[model samples]
Target chain A: KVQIVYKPVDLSKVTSKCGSLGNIHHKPGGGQVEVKSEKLDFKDRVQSKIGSLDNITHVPGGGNKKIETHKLTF
Target chain B: KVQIVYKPVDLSKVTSKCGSLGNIHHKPGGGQVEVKSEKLDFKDRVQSKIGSLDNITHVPGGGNKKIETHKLTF
Candidate 1:
């Protein structure tokens, strides 16, 4: 496995920035803390909600709301 | 309503980086400005094009060429 180690940001720090509505917390690559959250207001917001995080983005002609986030790499 | 507050980045800045070919500009939320752009060079470059920004990323099997950009939040 290709391992590129990285230091994780503090949970408290991200929580403060992302808010506490939809909270996601996990360990990435079996190492360090990984936190994610998504709060959807509209039906489309389900996709937009995920778009708010890093590594999550969109495609052309395929609907901007249909975002996809990258799996953790460590 | 559970609203998560966020600050938006300048549109002018995102446009400059995304290039004029496939430029995108809009509001990510009801809050503020949001901009995104994706230029397709090859059949696949269309996907990788958006891969270079924050909050956007790729899938595991579908294809890595697909790049997605997150909308604005301010």
Candidate 2:
């Protein structure tokens, strides 16, 4: 059986001084964070929504929105 | 009225020589792309799934997944 949970985190930028939205950091699997939820074809499913995720970004000192998901298997 | 649509895009990296997941790019508004979907608080709503968006990245050159959302208004 598998269970899912989500937590917020800070997204890093590819360029700090460029006029861009924001950049996403790497979640290299640690503690409870598994990783690699997608690749080529889903084969099984998109499993999540592709309808949002544009404005959630981090600034030099401003607040942002981004979440990380963990799928725990037992 | 407002309608939403999503299209796939290639994400860039913040660093190329690091053992990280990947980096995101700047989605400046252009044509049908309105840009921005989150920041700080939603106030109105989170509106999108904060569940997915972990594995969709560009690995120098490999099959990946990522999508951009556009809210068309008339």
Candidate 3:
């Protein structure tokens, strides 16, 4: 078994994209960690589409709010 | 869903390695085929260690022969 070390080009970019797809932990200084599991399809959702990835509904921990936030008045 | 197109280099090398790991079909002119399924881990088995990938037990359609060939003498 071989492990390829991958350096994160834009870490801010990486975390914004893959932070919450399940068991994906990012380390400082671009460490190569094993992806234990994933909720999204990496090829279909992430790679090569970084620029437009923000509003794509596959942004991991964002969107589909379970609770609503409202201002309460007297 | 986005599909990243992959160009095959040294098809003789690719086929020799990934020829039989389950549902892997190689096209003649370097096609980007989807890996519908796989028996071996791509990161652990294939990429980076291409040269030494042989004899690694995960070479797709090889090894562990169920039937033994015996020479019959009269």
Candidate 4:
């Protein structure tokens, strides 16, 4: 199962949502992260990661979104 | 008025639509072009330009679209 999270991420508020997480992978364009989880959802995933953003300040701007992809071993 | 033209620009067929036009500016990520026109619409614009696209072959691929922006002199 895969879950993609898209929201206006406030840089200062990253910690409250993520809460001391796992390894974080930074993306190239918008610094979005990809979290590989052994569980179906982050709340139940074996490994979880989180990243940050300052929000899209430009009218025609683009920002990052976090995606969680997983494959069940069994 | 402003006209934004979007299509799957075949590289070989770029000329037929643009028809000996004006300057074309290439964007960073998608190599798309931005054309500034005095006539508002390219079909009636003072300065017309065209760009090319290979078609969105990928299911989740992103591409370029041409935009014509203008402000009348008189």
lDDT of candidate 1 over B7-62, digit per residue (tens): 33322211111211222332232222233433312332122212122332321111
Q: What is the lDDT of residue A13 in candidate 3?
A: 14
User: Distance from true position, residue B31, model 1, in Å?
Assistant: 24
Alpha-carbon runs more than 4 Å astray in model 2:
A1-46, A60-74, B1-27, B31-74
Error of 2 at B50 (Å): 14
Error of 2 at B27 (Å): 8.1
Candidate 4 ranges with C-alpha deviation above 4 Å: A1-74, B1-60
**lDDT tens per residue, model 3, B20-56:** 1232222122212121222323332222211110111
Q: Quick one: best lDDT, which candidate?
A: 2
- Native-to-model Cα distance after best TM-score fit, residue A3 in candidate 4, in Å: 62
Q: Looking at candidate 4, what is the lDDT of residue A64?
A: 24
In model 2 chain B, the worst 10-residue window by lDDT is B59-68
Per-residue alpha-carbon lDDT of candidate 2 for residues B7-54, written as tens digits (9 for 90 to 100): 323344342222333355544332221223333232233343442323
lDDT (CA) per prediction: 0.25, 0.31, 0.21, 0.24
**Model 4 lDDT per residue over B29-66, tens place:** 32232333232222221332132222121111112232
lDDT-best of 3 and 4: 4
lDDT for residue A47 in candidate 3, whole number 0-100: 27
Kindly report which residue stretches of model 1 are placed more than 4 angstroms away from their true locations once superposed.
A1-54, A62-74, B1-20, B23-54, B57-74
